[PDB]
UniProtKB/TrEMBL annotation, chain A:
It holds the Pfam family KOW. It comes from Plasmodium falciparum (isolate 3D7). One of its GO terms (molecular function) is RNA binding. This is 40S ribosomal protein S4. The keyword Ribosomal protein applies.
UniProtKB/TrEMBL annotation, chain B:
Residues 106-170 form the RNA-binding S4 domain. Residues 5-105 form the Small ribosomal subunit protein uS4 N-terminal domain. It comes from Plasmodium falciparum (isolate 3D7). Gene3D superfamilies: RNA-binding S4 domain. This is 40S ribosomal protein S9, putative. One of its GO terms (biological process) is ribosomal small subunit biogenesis. GO terms for molecular function: rRNA binding; structural constituent of ribosome. It comes from the Eukaryota. One of its GO terms (cellular component) is cytosolic small ribosomal subunit. The keyword Ribonucleoprotein applies. InterPro entries: Ribosomal_uS4 (IPR022801), Ribosomal_uS4_CS (IPR018079), Ribosomal_uS4_euk/arc (IPR005710), Ribosomal_uS4_N (IPR001912), S4_RNA-bd (IPR002942), S4_RNA-bd_sf (IPR036986). Keywords: Ribonucleoprotein, Ribosomal protein, RNA-binding, rRNA-binding.
TrEMBL record, chain C:
This is 40S ribosomal protein S8. The lineage of its organism: Eukaryota, Sar, Alveolata, Apicomplexa, Aconoidasida. GO terms for cellular component: cytosolic small ribosomal subunit. It comes from the Eukaryota. The keyword rRNA-binding does not apply.
Length: 257, 185, 172
RNA sequence: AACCUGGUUGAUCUUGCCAGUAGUCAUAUGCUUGUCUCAAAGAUUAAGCCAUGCAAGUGAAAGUAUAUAUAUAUAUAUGUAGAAACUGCGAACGGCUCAUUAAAACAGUUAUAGUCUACUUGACAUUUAUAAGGAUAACUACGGAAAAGCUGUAGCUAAUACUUGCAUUAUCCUUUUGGAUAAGUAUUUGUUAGAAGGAAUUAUAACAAAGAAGUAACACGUAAAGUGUGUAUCAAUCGAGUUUCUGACCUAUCAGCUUUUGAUGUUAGGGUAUUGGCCUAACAUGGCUAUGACGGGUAACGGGGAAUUAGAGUUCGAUUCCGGAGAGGGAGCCUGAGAAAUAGCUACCACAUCUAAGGAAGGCAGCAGGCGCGUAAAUUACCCAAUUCUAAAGAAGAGAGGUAGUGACAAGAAAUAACAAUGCAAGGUUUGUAUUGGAAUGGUGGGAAUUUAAAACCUUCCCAGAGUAACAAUUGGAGGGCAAGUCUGGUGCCAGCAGCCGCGGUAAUUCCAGCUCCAAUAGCGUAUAUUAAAAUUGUUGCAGUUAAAACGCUCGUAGUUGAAUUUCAAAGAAUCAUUCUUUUUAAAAUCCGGAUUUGUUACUUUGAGUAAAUUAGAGUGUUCAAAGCAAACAGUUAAAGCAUUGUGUUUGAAUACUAUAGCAUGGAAUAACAAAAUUGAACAAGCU
RNA sequence: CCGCCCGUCGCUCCUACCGAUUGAAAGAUAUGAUGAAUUGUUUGGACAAGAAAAAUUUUUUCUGGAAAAACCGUAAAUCCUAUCUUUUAAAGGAAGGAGAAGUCGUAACAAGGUUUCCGUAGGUGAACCUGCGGAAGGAUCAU
């Protein structure tokens, strides 16, 4: 007939799933949801390939059936629910809290995290709609609509967003020296300060992001996620702290162990 | 669908199949290091050749080009591990200077022959195939096996051999014993 | 039917290699007329219903000067910059000039101030006034009745009105 | 491994082909084959035809059960199952094939300010009620038809089927209380007003008119008051449609095409989900083309890629992924969020099955399987265990998928002995090779351990278990090319061989044999194609007096190519004459005497952004290796760590390749082009 | 040089061409005719639910609605041409290549016994001959 595609082939699966070529013909195909399949990750993968709590899809399903895994604090029983960049996972029985982050490679790690910090999540606004009764609503990368957002919030900036209640805490403008994480090409794990934004007329607004080794790298503004003010990040970053080393340096590090 | 389990040719053929000198050389190599075909030689050439090619490529790049330093260094390290170079000759110009003897030396059978164990190369090979020999815990019954210098010292008769302490345990010796017993009784 | 099957600008035959994909839908024209109201529903793409008016009369007509609107029977079609056939057949489309039963506007005016929210000061044209005197006034249609299912329109004014009169002009 | 040998001659040097030579994820076929791993396989011919079986269903709190069964608690109460059917969701995915199709599709690159978008997520609503209206299935009874996934009648009865249909918020006065005015979500029209985006007829707000659909007459019993089902708009998402730019093979023995039949445009409409000659009407006379239009051919689906290459390249790409298309051939619809669906329907054509001859159903380019075609291709196997999908979503299904079977397609590893005595041999005492004879071991046979959904293999152990180690290696050669016989017989310009040159006319180193040798060896030949060899298509990189080849000559359009010229230079510090760095030498605008911008494009440099699989490549003893994407570490079971008795720990699955176009970007050279005098612009004053 | 060899003429084999035959065949478009099915609209109105009257029947109005029909519009298919492409037959004709020690000459290679060769025209069993103007690839680098 011809409509949408329900299946995903295991080689056509996006690399940072890190699936096998063997070990299956297909991949899980993230449900539609709050994240873009190419930059998400289904819950199945998390449960089975990352934490390794499950050996199989079946086990994951079973786990889900006990209403014990929460993603952003409300439960999910959909095995192929997409988790995505910043989202806190609360596996209830272990009393583990994860937050998904990026590695210095493209790969999702589940970070491990405290009760206290778990209660919020960072969310970058994308669009800021006006709706009926001249009320503004931000729309986050979490595919979530924040209504009655504080007026000073502008199109690219992140927002520290509470989970227990839908309301926001604080917001961090997209400034010239704002601690930033990346979430797309090459420099994906990378975490920097920002030197400069280009602001091209018709095109993508390219930005340059100085690291803490002072290695500058550029990136589209699209795929940059504000994470702090110049001093401190508002989230716990992984062990590497977004310092994508050179290849040689990495090898040296590996050797020294 | 097709499987994704990709596979690769390990050995290229000659080109000129009845060149005399080359043939003679091959034969000599076979003689010295107890090899079954020209195929083995070809395989080893291929192995060598890839490395050589890599080295050549690296040399085309300048020093302190990232690629050259990283990949080249890695190659060098690998060579060292393999027992191709060691202390004196670890500079990437040297990995070109490898020949076939250097590689054949590190075959398991050759190593076995060297380190006592068997009277010959052929003998060593048969020993290896006949499930004796071990290279650090693990038994190994392929003579090709390129021993790395890390696991050169840890080569001897396996735990479970007749002449590594685990009963005569043969069709032969056991049978003989049985016969003797019968004779006695 | 919205698709290819057409020469290539260089005038080369596009050799067709594709049936007709339903999303290239060219469902046929509702020649919507005068009469008592009668409208069908055609089911466009994602259950997006659209209202094929096939007979009409009582469209919403606006009076732009004063920026108001009223529902009136429309009594005749008199011009169609597409083609005269349509006007002959009395078919309503999105730029048909038609005649409104124009008592309502007059009534409204009377109610508000005088006799033939309020930024009044403009106070009417001569031609328009004359038209009103006979009861019946020229007015564009502005909805696409065939899609929307309403003959919504507006009263034709000043320069445009004059032009349309000229077009109409009788003469021989 | 950036490679060449034989063949024109009496000999020679060339040109030049032929021949050899190697490879092919490249088919066939011949002979041969003991292990193991891995695994392509009715593409090529006929997108030819198909018997039978199967390939999409779905119910584990949660629409509908007096079919029905059943267990508790006191004839009722709860309950627990539940065939059937209605409803819902799915069946638009997947799978197959490659016929079409050559600026089409596809790839990258935009665009959607020109749209649609079910499920999923998050926001979140507007003009009788202690609960409404019928009418329908299964079912009961009566039927019909040879037959069909045929249905007739009558009678019931549900539903989350179908259909009705019940305060508060914002604007103004008073001290949180009491009044006044309003009060429709999309959508559409007219009138205006205008936190983003480069840009708005955008969001939005108001006014005047219409206006759908909706806002629970639903179902569980849950959580620490919750959920399921449904629902208006918005956003997200899974996408889709269109769309920009750039990019393709052969053919000029295809040069003019397109336009009544929309060709090119403008206007108005119709239509669409939206843009659009997409369609209609009216009006222009355009549009494409030697930078190849338009035809023709393709034994053409495109791409990721494959083979082969030193480097260029050449060929291939039906075929693991992405995209397109198609379900015998066209065409047409219904349903639905999504189909112009084909295990949906209508029709015709072409095939074809049953029929009691009235009718009826049917579509393997799903999986097997069969006939046909053919040089050319496997089982009517077992299972949902893994991977996934669908469902009322652990619990069911799935020929999707996996597992075996056949399998010398390929690919990897690897047996067919080894060793020691004398005997014999040769060498300057040691290697080599005929008798013996104890060790070794797979194979093969049978048990287990394991493996597995269940088996089978793998590995593992234990019994069996080699001397002609009959557990028997072949294939093709021995004139040259080309490694190896002027060994023995047979044939006698016959038979034959011989890719090529040649051999054979009774000494054949070439036939037919035997023996011996050589190569590659569980493989080795033959054929056709292809790459390299081919600098024999030549960009790198050919040749043109005489070898093939300078147009008879000149002019000439496109094409290609185009003199020099415009800021040259200078000084200081480090290093082993050179390298890398700092500073200034004019003019204009900008900033509080100091400090900082200055043609366009090519080109180049950095980026950005790209699927993986393949490729290169890092790591990793799959026993090695082909692989794979895993792993390593500590322990007869605990220390050590770190956590406030409990908890293994370290990690890895890099990186580069992703055009020739597009995006941003540093640029001094080299190129273009633009700026520039029968006159061109720069200031200061004055006048408007 | 008793070398080499050229062409016709016979004979056998194979290849492709021309070929009357409106040759044939399949396929492809293009036109036209008829035109199944069918979206849409229009007409219809078997009937199923209302309203009007009498004691279940009568007459009239409003709703939804099947068949059937008409008109555009998609448009299969069939037939007729036309054109093109592709294989394919054919008496005869006329080439080519191969073969066989066949016929006739001697064209060319030597000053090849008329130097050769070019273009052109005519001739002739056949090689060829001749005319005109060229060339040396001449048998002359020379008065
Ligand atoms: Mg289709
Ligand atoms: Mg053993
Ligand atoms: Mg050849
Ligand atoms: Mg075995
Ligand atoms: Mg076929
Ligand atoms: Mg196939
Ligand atoms: Mg359930
Ligand atoms: Mg049921
Ligand atoms: Mg599909
Ligand atoms: Mg309903
Ligand atoms: Mg027209
Ligand atoms: Mg084709
Ligand atoms: Mg392909
Ligand atoms: Mg084909
Ligand atoms: Mg078929
Ligand atoms: Mg169809
Ligand atoms: Mg089928
Ligand atoms: Mg059919
Ligand atoms: Mg089949
Ligand atoms: Mg085969
Ligand atoms: Mg399963
Ligand atoms: Mg299958
Ligand atoms: Mg030789
Ligand atoms: Mg041969
Ligand atoms: Mg002889
Ligand atoms: Mg012989
Ligand atoms: Mg070639
Ligand atoms: Mg070459
Ligand atoms: Mg040449
Ligand atoms: Mg010549
Ligand atoms: Mg000339
Ligand atoms: Mg010119
Ligand atoms: Mg120049
Ligand atoms: Mg003379
Ligand atoms: Mg003569
Ligand atoms: Mg003569
Ligand atoms: Mg004469
Ligand atoms: Mg004469």
């Amino acid at each position: 007939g011809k409509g949408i595609k329900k299946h995903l082939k295991r080689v056509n699966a996006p690399s940072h799933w890190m699936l096998n070529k063997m070990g299956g013909q297909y991949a899980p195909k993230t449900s539609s949801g709050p994240h873009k399949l190419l930059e998400s990750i289904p819950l199945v993968i998390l449960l089975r390939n990352r934490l390794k709590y499950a050996l199989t899809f079946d086990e994951v399903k079973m786990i889900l059936i006990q209403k014990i895994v929460k993603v952003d604090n409300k439960v999910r029983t959909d095995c192929t629910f997409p988790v995505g960049l910043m989202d806190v996972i609360h596996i209830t029985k272990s009393n583990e809290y994860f937050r998904l982050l990026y590695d210095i490679k493209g790969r999702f790690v589940p970070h491990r995290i405290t009760n206290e910090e778990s209660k919020y999540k960072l969310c970058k606004v994308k669009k800021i709609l006006l709706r009926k009764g001249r009320l503004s609503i931000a729309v986050t990368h979490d595919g979530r609509s924040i209504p009655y957002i504080h007026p000073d919030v502008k199109v690219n900036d992140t927002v520290r967003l509470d989970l227990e209640t839908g309301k926001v805490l604080e917001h961090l403008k997209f400034q010239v020296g704002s601690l930033v994480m990346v979430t797309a090409g090459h420099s994906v794990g990378r975490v920097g300060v920002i030197s400069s934004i280009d602001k091209n007329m018709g095109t993508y607004d390219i930005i340059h992001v100085k690291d803490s080794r002072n290695k500058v790298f550029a990136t589209r503004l699209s795929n940059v996620f504000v994470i702090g003010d110049n001093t401190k990040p508002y989230i716990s970053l992984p062990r590497e702290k977004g310092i994508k080393l050179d290849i040689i340096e990495e090898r040296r590090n590996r050797l020294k162990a | 669908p097709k499987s994704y389990r990709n596979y690769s040719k390990t050995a290229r053929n000659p080109k000129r199949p009845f060149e005399k000198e080359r043939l003679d050389q091959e034969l000599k190599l076979i003689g010295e290091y107890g090899l079954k075909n020209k195929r083995e030689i070809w395989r080893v050439q291929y192995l060598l050749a890839k490395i050589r090619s890599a080295a050549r490529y690296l040399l085309t790049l300048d020093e302190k080009s990232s690629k050259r330093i990283f990949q080249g260094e890695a190659l060098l390290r690998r060579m060292v591990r393999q027992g191709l170079l060691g202390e004196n000759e670890e500079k990437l110009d040297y990995v070109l200077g490898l020949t076939l003897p250097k590689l054949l030396e590190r075959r398991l059978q050759t190593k076995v022959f060297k380190l006592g164990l068997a009277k010959s190369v052929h003998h060593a090979r048969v020993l290896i195939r006949q499930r004796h020999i071990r290279v650090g815990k693990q038994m190994v019954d392929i003579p090709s096996f390129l021993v790395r210098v890390d696991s050169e010292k840890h080569i001897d008769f396996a735990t479970t051999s007749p002449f590594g302490g685990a009963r005569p345990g043969r069709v032969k010796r056991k049978s003989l014993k049985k016969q003797k017993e019968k004779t006695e009784a | 039917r919205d698709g290819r099957h057409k020469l290539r600008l260089t005038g080369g035959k596009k050799k067709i290699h594709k049936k007709k994909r339903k999303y290239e839908l060219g469902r046929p024209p509702s020649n919507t007329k005068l009469g008592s109201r009668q409208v069908h529903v055609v089911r466009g793409r994602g259950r997006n219903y659209k209202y094929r008016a096939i007979k009409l009369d009582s469209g919403s007509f606006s009076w732009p000067t004063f920026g108001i609107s009223k529902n009136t029977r429309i009594i005749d079609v008199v011009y169609n910059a597409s083609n005269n056939e349509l006007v002959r057949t009395k078919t309503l489309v999105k730029n048909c000039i038609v005649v409104i039963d124009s008592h309502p506007f007059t009534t409204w005016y009377e109610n508000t101030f005088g006799t033939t929210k309020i930024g009044k000061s403009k106070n009417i044209d001569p031609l328009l006034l004359e038209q009103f005197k006979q009861g019946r006034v020229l007015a564009c249609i502005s909805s696409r009745p065939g899609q929307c299912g309403k003959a919504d329109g507006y009263i034709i004014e000043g320069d445009e009105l004059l032009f349309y009169k000229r077009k109409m002009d009788k003469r021989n």
